[PDB]
Amino acid sequence: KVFGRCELAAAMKRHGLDNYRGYSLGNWVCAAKFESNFNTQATNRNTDGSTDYGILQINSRWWCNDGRTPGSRNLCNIPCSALLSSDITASVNCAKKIVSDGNGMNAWVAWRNRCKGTDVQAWIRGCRL
Ligand SMILES: [Cl-]
Ligand SMILES: [Cl-]
Ligand SMILES: [Cl-]
Ligand SMILES: [Cl-]
Ligand SMILES: [Cl-]
Ligand SMILES: [Cl-]
Ligand SMILES: [Cl-]
Ligand code: NA
């Protein structure tokens, strides 16, 4: 599913992401825009043989099992295909583990390079939340 900006903001708010570990909702929308272009089906293969899955491009080396990433962990305890669902619940629950891990949202390279230190409130402007 390809989400609208406000539709996704509302879904993330209902799943408890607004101010989760201090990150306002605009941060999560900005990250999703630049990671996946708001497309739950996005996949991208990395040089190391790991793959990034879904709206928040969660990586198979640490967070999910795709059956093809040797010596990988599955810290979210989910098949990576669960992250491509139109229901963002599995992605959100896994993102909460990731952002609690010590690096905060710096774990998302697109957030660090394209969202961090920008006016992220702009991503939820105009939305009925
Ligand atoms: Cl947009
Ligand atoms: Cl915000
Ligand atoms: Cl694997
Ligand atoms: Cl594991
Ligand atoms: Cl699994
Ligand atoms: Cl959803
Ligand atoms: Cl933090
Ligand atoms: Na894995």
Side-chain angles (χ1 to χ4, degrees):
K1 164 175 186 185
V2 180
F3 279 82
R5 171 178 69 87
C6 293
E7 181 184 17
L8 180 64
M12 287 175 153
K13 185 160 176 197
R14 189 173 76 82
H15 289 279
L17 278 185
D18 191 14
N19 292 128
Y20 192 80
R21 288 273 170 147
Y23 292 94
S24 69
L25 193 52
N27 284 287
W28 299 99
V29 174
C30 184
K33 170 74 181 156
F34 293 126
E35 287 292 353
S36 67
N37 206 28
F38 298 145
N39 182 3
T40 68
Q41 298 197 66
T43 60
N44 282 297
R45 182 92 101 138
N46 303 310
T47 61
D48 75 342
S50 64
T51 303
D52 297 337
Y53 295 85
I55 197 76
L56 286 168
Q57 288 292 276
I58 294 171
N59 186 77
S60 63
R61 179 50 52 64
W62 298 105
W63 303 106
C64 63
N65 188 204
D66 64 5
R68 67 169 203 190
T69 310
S72 84
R73 295 298 303 256
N74 180 14
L75 284 181
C76 294
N77 267 298
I78 44 157
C80 300
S81 58
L83 301 170
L84 302 181
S85 175
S86 55
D87 172 8
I88 65 164
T89 304
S91 285
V92 164
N93 289 346
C94 188
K96 290 174 160 162
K97 185 152 287 164
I98 294 171
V99 77
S100 301
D101 203 42
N103 287 2
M105 281 198 79
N106 293 297
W108 288 278
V109 170
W111 179 84
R112 196 164 41 68
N113 292 323
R114 303 187 70 184
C115 299
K116 184 177 197 178
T118 69
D119 171 35
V120 292
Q121 316 68 236
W123 286 100
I124 62 172
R125 188 151 314 126
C127 300
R128 196 166 203 330
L129 310 177

